[PDB]
């Protein structure tokens, strides 16, 4: 009885066990939730013959 009750109390107070993959996913989700930084007017081309 004492050890079983202590096991129940400890597992109740600790909570579910999460592996490293869950923590890595949470960390990545934080940066994803930060949101992308959008900047316009960046060129998508380079000139080989400038118009004249």
């Amino acid at each position: 009885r004492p050890m079983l009750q202590a096991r129940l109390e400890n597992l109740q107070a600790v909570g579910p066990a999460f592996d490293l993959d869950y923590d890595q996913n949470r960390a990545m989700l934080n940066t994803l939730n930060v949101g992308p930084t959008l900047d316009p007017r960046f060129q998508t081309y380079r000139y080989l013959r400038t118009p004249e």
């Binding site: 989700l29 992308p36 316009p40 060129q43 380079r46």
Partner: protein, 156 residues
């Protein structure tokens, strides 16, 4: 008079793409870990240049550029039919000749205007306009992909 001018373009560099290159690299790295579909896909530069080329030769881009070029607005008689015909003619003025990699020739764009300085200024403005439109479209695509990835990660 029909003065003509020619421009030749190629893929941009890493340094001129700005932060979009880093954001797309981050998204591709995320795609590498899960939903493996890289298969040595074309780099970000190729995608950006493909979008720019697509926006360069599109009829809609030429029409929208001419509608605001401030050089077409001066030649407006006020009749709808005449304005439409002139707009169609000037849209046909701008031509795009795709390049062939086998013969080492690049993509070129040719513009025809009425005066010599206008054959240069209008071509520069048109290229800038197409680049800006391609950049906006790429930003929208990046936002959509980012939202989809965020939703997938939340579900996982």
């Amino acid at each position: 008079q029909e003065w003509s001018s020619t421009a030749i373009t190629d893929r941009p560099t890493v340094n001129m793409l700005g932060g979009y290159y880093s954001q797309q690299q981050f998204l591709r790295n995320l795609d590498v870990r899960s939903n493996m579909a890289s298969a040595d896909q074309p780099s970000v530069m190729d995608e950006a240049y493909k979008e720019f080329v697509m926006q360069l030769a599109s009829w809609d881009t030429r029409r929208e550029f001419w509608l605001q070029t401030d050089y077409y607005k001066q030649r407006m008689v006020g009749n709808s039919k005449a304005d439409a015909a002139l707009l169609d003619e000037m849209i046909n003025n701008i031509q795009f000749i795709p390049g062939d990699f086998t013969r080492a020739v690049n993509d070129s764009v040719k513009l025809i205007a009425e005066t010599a300085p206008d054959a240069n200024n209008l071509l520069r403005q048109y290229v800038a306009f197409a680049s800006q439109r391609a950049a906006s479209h790429l930003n929208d695509e990046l936002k959509g992909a980012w939202a989809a990835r965020t939703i997938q990660m939340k579900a996982q």
